[PDB]
Design an enzyme around this catalytic site. Sequence first.
Site, PDB file in Angstrom:
ATOM      1  N   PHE A 128       0.815  -1.205   0.000  1.00 15.35           N
ATOM      2  CA  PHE A 128       0.000   0.000   0.000  1.00 15.35           C
ATOM      3  C   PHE A 128       0.851   1.258   0.000  1.00 15.35           C
ATOM      4  CE2 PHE A 128      -2.779   2.800   3.009  1.00 15.35           C
ATOM      5  CZ  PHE A 128      -3.022   3.696   1.970  1.00 15.35           C
ATOM      6  N   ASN A 156      -3.367  13.925   5.364  1.00 11.83           N
ATOM      7  CA  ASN A 156      -4.197  14.996   5.904  1.00 11.83           C
ATOM      8  C   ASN A 156      -5.293  14.458   6.808  1.00 11.83           C
ATOM      9  OD1 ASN A 156      -6.600  14.254   4.358  1.00 11.83           O
ATOM     10  ND2 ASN A 156      -5.565  15.112   2.568  1.00 11.83           N
ATOM     11  N   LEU A 161      -7.811   6.749  -2.441  1.00 11.35           N
ATOM     12  CA  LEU A 161      -7.210   7.980  -1.927  1.00 11.35           C
ATOM     13  C   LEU A 161      -7.364   9.076  -2.971  1.00 11.35           C
ATOM     14  CD1 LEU A 161      -3.806   6.668  -0.503  1.00 11.35           C
ATOM     15  CD2 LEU A 161      -5.752   7.488   0.861  1.00 11.35           C
TER      16      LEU A 161
END
Length: 166
Positions: free
Chosen positions: A62, A103, A123
């Site tokens: 990932f 974030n 994402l």
Amino acid sequence: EPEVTAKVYFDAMIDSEPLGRITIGLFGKDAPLTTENFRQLCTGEHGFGYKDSIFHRVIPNFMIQGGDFTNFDGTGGKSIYGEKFADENLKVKHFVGALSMANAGPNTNGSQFFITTAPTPWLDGRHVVFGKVLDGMDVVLRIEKTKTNSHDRPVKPVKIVASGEL
């Protein structure tokens, strides 16, 4: 694939074991504010930055995450503008070897970032992709296989012993 306008690098180590150099290309035209923040954190121009920080989180297949040079646990970090700055370009999708800002919701970019080591479509649209690994992908891949424990944190610190502009 967007345009590379600047190149920075990270020299990584794992307990006396030198891993090599990661060369990153930044998309200055598509994310000017994000790239400059990353660029100036690599050089340490302001007194703080990536030199001597670690990759606190590693999720194999990932991504690898770093950038928290204040709390070293994923809860810290800060930009050169201030605490947080706005999202610039959300239309650029992730791909293997991409550098993207971490974030906690919209317009909360600080200094934390991650490098994707696989497709991460979940994402896309939510994180600003501001660059890509030009060289040293094998280093990234080696870091990805390091032994983790709880919370996916490397059992042995994966340190950025040096960073700067190339």
